[PDB]
Paper text:
The polysaccharides in red algae (Rhodophyta) are primarily mixed galactan agars such as agarose and carrageenan. Carrageenans are high molecular weight polymers having a linear backbone of repeating D-galactopyranose units (G) linked together by alternating α-1,3 and β-1,4 linkages. Furthermore, transcriptomics revealed upregulation of the CarPUL during growth on ι-carrageenan, while biochemical analysis of eight CarPUL-encoded enzymes revealed carrageenan-specific activity, thus associating the CarPUL with the ability of these pseudoalteromonads to liberate energy from carrageenan. Detailed analysis of the enzyme activities encoded by the CarPUL, combined with interpretation of growth phenotypes, have allowed us to propose a refined and detailed model of κ- and ι-carrageenan processing by some Pseudoalteromonas species.
Despite extensive efforts, we were unable to circumvent generation of this inappropriately matured form of the protein. Therefore, to provide insight to the specificity of this enzyme we generated C84A and C84S mutants and attempted to determine structures of this protein in complex with neocarrageenan oligosaccharides and fragments thereof [Supplementary Notes (section 4) and Supplementary Fig. 10a–c]. Taken together, these results support assignment of S1_NC as an exo-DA2S carrageenan sulfatase that would likely have activity on any form of carrageenan having a non-reducing end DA2S residue (e.g., ι- or α-carrageenan).
Residue numbers in the entry:
A (entry chain A): 36 to 507
B (entry chain B): 35 to 507
Write the structure that this text describes.
């Protein structure tokens, strides 16, 4: 029974790290990447916290678990993942793992502890269940201030980026790290196999870091991507609407957008420090050599691509793609360019830990790819499936299928679907859904999507077959 | 011996506009029907939204039972049609030998009245394919962007709010609906079978679009605006702030724009009163009127700048929740009913008139006892109405309101903020008393009445209600 450590980051993009030729020096994460299996085409299940984390820890899609929206936020109907879903936490506890959780669960108050984990520290550890949804009255007020031409301290916009006082040592990140260090120190004292999960606040927006992380990256020097700042042409209406108050970016100057990038880059540098501290503690405690490690970000985050901030009901790569490293100490490092999914984490843990079956696995174990490289999947369709069923009480029922060359997005709450040529338009600027030059690729993707919805028993297959009747 | 029944169903018609209600618009034809029938002056819709209200009206069950709990065919609702497993009063009446006819929009799925056995004579959704993509309001979005830039449409108007149409009454959709209604009455008078006719009028759905002389009949300069007009919402739920449909951004509206929204609406009500006169005079000419069992109703009201709101959205304010209702039974002397009654009470009333067969639960009650006896039919009973706003076009809110003659409590389980209004001292619902200790006893009473109602209708939200209201429970 191997020791397992999961380092789980909130809204961390795939692309920012130096090992991915990104703009931020990340030596600690690069070292882990180069020692483990790099999943360079990892895709989240949904660009939203609770749905992604329920998929990650259960191995099933939201229509099976019921966890298909964020919990405890205006205006979601949901409060918690059902205690009927034990997740890998209860399954690992059931076979003699000491499971520990640091940081926020995002799946209901007390959730890790109710499933048998030592919930060492975190926002939702001691909260009462069935709380009223958090309704962002203060954020609404503050975005109205920005629209009136006001700024916060030192000309900043604190719903986007903020210089925190004090030092790294004063941060929530430093606390999460210290509880992870304690978790590793305490596991080294035990005979029993351990399963540790550290769920980091960072880099959740707004981008809030102390000096020197706050000014490490000069906003003037930021390289803005080709889809930055553009007007959305022929895109679905859900990308326009102000779902969370800070989605009104009409007030953002180019300087505001560059600081959103530079402060985000500071947060990634601070995360790289935090990863180094935890890895060095595992090494000091003699746990690192045999440690089975997953580093993952639940989803990415928008920094003004398509003039979007944060996240919302859409499928763009900057949100859908996720960073993923899985380090098996028995295996030589490889880089996997075949697409993989958040639905593949629970099966991988299941194979590592011999977890007991608790129902369906909608994904697959990544051990064959980790051992053999991309040739494990020779002959198979290279696809990923993404869902955006809800955004905080807005129903959208979105489904995206992504091949290495194309993406088709079904928006059943709209009349406008999306079709992107990823080979010729990797920045997803031009919606080709109505372009007759793409009829063959669309027809192919529609068939692949029907096959995926059938495979996972998604009940929206019926509506899909109605909407796509021109192609069947 | 089965009676002839006619339903005149109007879209977003307020309770208060008519001259028989001491309102601003001269409505002699509707007044004559009110004076001949049973006035339900405290009628409440089930939801301030078309498809939910009409599924409640025609099934007699709440949308958690029927599944019809949002609009159909609109960005970004999940729904397309009322299940064919719900026959409604249409199939039920057909099954017992009524010739059922439908004129105008169904709003419950393409071909719906026809699939249930009605002659769907004419209407927007009569010949449409089913399972169509949701109508997504790209042009209204672009229009409101022009408004926000300071633009006006032709002649200074704002056509997402009010519009002078060219030509005459005779050129209008209203005139076409009336012509098909006249043919319906003429056809009924020639048949042996009892008839059940439903005319579902487009008017007065916003924007307020009428030809001359209705467009200028009521001078915008003379419009009396109410006490809750134009106010800043204080301590009100976040769902009232959000621009759900693009025309909900009224930041660009002048006081003149709001007065023309009223004056064009009043013109539409005058045009409706003409249309009602035409159909009633055809019923009289055909020898049907003396024995005709009539319901006149608006599916819900509509906001005209009260709490700075336009049209409708997920909220429970009286101008939306209240509906006009007149029920005329030719065997009964006229009465005014001030007890609250609900859209859930229409299907049971039809059931008692027509001896319709049982097709499951009735969540409301027949209004025949009130029509015969007056308000004292309900002596010793709590005077309450229940309202739900489960969805607004793909936005989930799960709202429930209970209204007594003196108080309203609104539960907003998508929010941290509930509403409590003192209707006796604050009938304009300006002040949210939810946190005011002086109202603790009334709030406790309303929370218990709401729990009782959710239990009665087997609403599965009662679990969450018991958590949110645990300080009571
Ligand atoms: O930790 S939380 O994600 O729960 O923090 C939330 C909230 O985060 C949200 O912000 C918007 C709305 O939903 C998404 C994002 O698009 C979610 O990340 C955060 O912004 C707010 O300030 O704190 C709450 C917790 O109270
Ligand atoms: O006759 S319809 O109601 O179907 O017309 C709709 C639309 O009406 C809607 O307008 C907003 C969105 O939901 C409510 C209201 O709040 C609904 O009445 C109408 O405005 C538009 O012009 O036409 C569509 C049908 O195509
Ligand atoms: Ca997240
Ligand atoms: Ca309506």
């Amino acid at each position: 029974k191997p020791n397992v450590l999961i380092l789980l980051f909130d809204d961390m993009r795939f692309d920012t790290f130096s090992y991915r030729n990104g703009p931020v020096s990340t030596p600690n994460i690069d070292a882990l990447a180069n020692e483990g299996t790099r999943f360079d085409q990892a895709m989240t299940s949904t660009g939203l916290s609770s749905p992604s984390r329920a998929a990650m820890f259960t191995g099933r899609w939201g229509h099976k678990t019921g966890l298909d929206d964020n919990v405890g936020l205006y205006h979601s109907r949901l409060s918690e993942l059902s205690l009927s879903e034990g997740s890998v936490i209860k399954r690992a506890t059931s076979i003699g793992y000491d499971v520990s959780y640091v940081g926020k669960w995002h799946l209901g108050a007390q959730g890790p502890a109710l499933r048998g984990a030592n919930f060492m520290w975190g926002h939702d550890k001691d909260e009462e269940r069935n709380g009223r949804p958090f309704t962002p009255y203060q954020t609404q007020k503050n975005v109205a201030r920005m629209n009136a031409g006001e700024r916060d301290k030192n000309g900043e916009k604190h719903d986007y980026y903020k210089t925190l006082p004090g030092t790294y040592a004063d941060t929530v990140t430093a606390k999460e790290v210290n509880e992870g260090k304690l978790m590793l120190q305490n596991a080294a004292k035990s005979d029993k196999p351990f399963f540790g999960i550290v769920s980091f606040e960072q880099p959740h927006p707004p981008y809030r870091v102390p000096e020197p992380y706050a000014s490490m990256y000069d906003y003037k020097d930021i390289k803005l991507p080709k889809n930055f700042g553009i007007k959305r042409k022929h895109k679905p209406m859900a990308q326009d609407d102000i779902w969370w108050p800070w989605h009104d970016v009409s007030h953002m100057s180019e300087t505001d957008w560059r600081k959103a990038h530079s402060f985000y880059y500071g947060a990634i540098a601070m995360i790289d420090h935090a990863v180094g501290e935890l890895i060095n503690t595992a090494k000091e405690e003699g746990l690192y050599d045999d440690l089975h490690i997953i580093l993952v970000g639940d989803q990415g985050s928008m920094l003004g691509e398509h003039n979007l901030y944060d996240k919302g009901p859409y499928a763009y790569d900057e949100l859908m793609r996720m960073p993923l490293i899985i380090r098996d100490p028995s295996l030589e490092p490889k880089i996997i360019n075949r697409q993989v999914s958040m639905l593949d984490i629970a099966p991988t843990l299941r194979q590592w830990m011999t977890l007991p079956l608790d129902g369906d696995e909608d994904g697959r174990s990544l051990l064959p790819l980790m051992k053999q490289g991309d040739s494990a999947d020779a002959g198979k369709d290279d696809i990923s499936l993404y869902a955006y069923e809800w955004y905080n009480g807005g129903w959208f029922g979105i489904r995206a299928i992504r091949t290495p060359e194309m993406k088709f997005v079904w928006n059943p709450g709209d009349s406008r679907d999306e079709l992107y040529d990823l080979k010729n338009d990797p920045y997803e600027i031009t919606n080709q859904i109505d372009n007759p030059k793409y009829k063959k690729q669309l027809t192919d993707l529609v068939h692949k999507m029907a096959g995926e919805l059938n495979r996972i028993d998604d009940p929206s297959l019926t509506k899909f077959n109605h909407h796509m009747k021109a192609f069947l």
